[PDB]
Amino acid sequence: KKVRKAVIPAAGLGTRFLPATKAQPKEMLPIVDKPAIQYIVEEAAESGIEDILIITGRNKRSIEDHFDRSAELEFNLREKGKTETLKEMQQIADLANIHYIRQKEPLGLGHAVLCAEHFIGDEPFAVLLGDDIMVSETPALRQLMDVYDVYGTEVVGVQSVLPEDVSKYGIINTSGSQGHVYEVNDLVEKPSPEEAPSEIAVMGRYVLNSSIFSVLKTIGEIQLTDALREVCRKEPIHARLLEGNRYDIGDKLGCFKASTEIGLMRPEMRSQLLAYLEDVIKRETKEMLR
């Protein structure tokens, strides 16, 4: 069974970005000129996912609207000649088939994954937390999916991190390592620097099975790791080192960084940007020498 369905939980009230997000959702904050959520749906589509369930909350209509056809916008783009544009707008609505479900009250990412139960039903599915953007010749998810196609168990997405960071993330407890594909025997959430049995963390990407669904039912906020953990006791899961560049967007500054770097891949903005940063640094030195 090929992975063809994915789950983006998106019910955060996103308080870290106040006041940008007082009256609009975190998932829509622009990254270069793209809403964060678009990057994630783009990953999925490019990995060959055909159906996404977005677990949404109150006042996130704008997400649903983003991925539909905006009539008034289509008209106005025509009457102005922006055909290349009108076309890029239509493609957004074509990426995937976007389903939505409301998470009732905020009970966390475990609840959220359970809400997907009947939608994915009896297929393996991808989960994508919307917390980092991945630049890669092979889409992050597609990577996790290729490990799945092989092992057929719960695969996790991973990247090494510097110790004294391990408390912010999670952790592969590896006792083996083969290919670009570590092998997982256990798991810990937010391990104190010493408690941490590795330097490798999971990068908000997953492929799971319906199995996991029942497992998470049983265990039952409901942390999703404990389930990926109680699967590991019965059997060993798998993790892929994610080839590509990772931009954490949990922070205000995280978003700043992400915008600049992705900015730098745009040809038209690369030199304009880079020039501009040179001249900001000059101005800052000159000022500080007075």
Next chain:
Amino acid sequence: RKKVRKAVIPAAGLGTRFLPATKAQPKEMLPIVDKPAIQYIVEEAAESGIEDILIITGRNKRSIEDHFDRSAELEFNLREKGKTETLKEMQQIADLANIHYIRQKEPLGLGHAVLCAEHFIGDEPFAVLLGDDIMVSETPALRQLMDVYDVYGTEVVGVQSVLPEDVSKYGIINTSGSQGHVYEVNDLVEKPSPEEAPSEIAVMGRYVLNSSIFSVLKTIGEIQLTDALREVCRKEPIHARLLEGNRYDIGDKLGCFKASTEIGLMRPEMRSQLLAYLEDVIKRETKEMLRL
């Protein structure tokens, strides 16, 4: 001899220059540093001593109206998390001014937009602020315009100079001369070719107008605000104020990025990490370029 206390902020664009960000959400809500662009404009107004703002809004721009109101679910979550600093901050936003909205029913640009405001202001002087730039100033930009009005009581336009190339990006003043910080506008073109332009002094989407401007705007009528200063010019000449502080255009993607960086570097909590990051990027770009 009346005080300016009402401003009109026209806000009914589809924000094409910003697609796909603005596909399903308004241009004025795009964040500059961590605050919506629209909030900057209200803030300038508030601190300029404006008490009553009319936003001329369009369809699917509810988020502006929500932004400046109590947000009960947010409030709750903030209390139940302790962020009393933030809860107070949010509460402040909702207090900056008296925000009124009207829908401009059909998009006929500014001018019509301004006419929309007619009954709301009735018979006073008012400010218009198009939001195309953020000004960092000791004295709030609009206040500066207002102080020249207090003295000359004509329509007063806010200005700064620009390099000749970009004089078709603007409306250009046409002085006889100047006196302290107040130029003496004799006429006004729309957006002139670099030689057709009779100055390199451009209007910075600030205006303090008089109620009279309505009569005017009606006679001319696609109603351009500029032409209705042109006619006010025929009978009698208008004033301009050179605007004290630092301007950051945000009409462009790049503009906004520059704005975010500039304003960001002014925030103490941010400054050191941001500067750090910036130096880093250049350092990293150098290494990788020299090895190629």
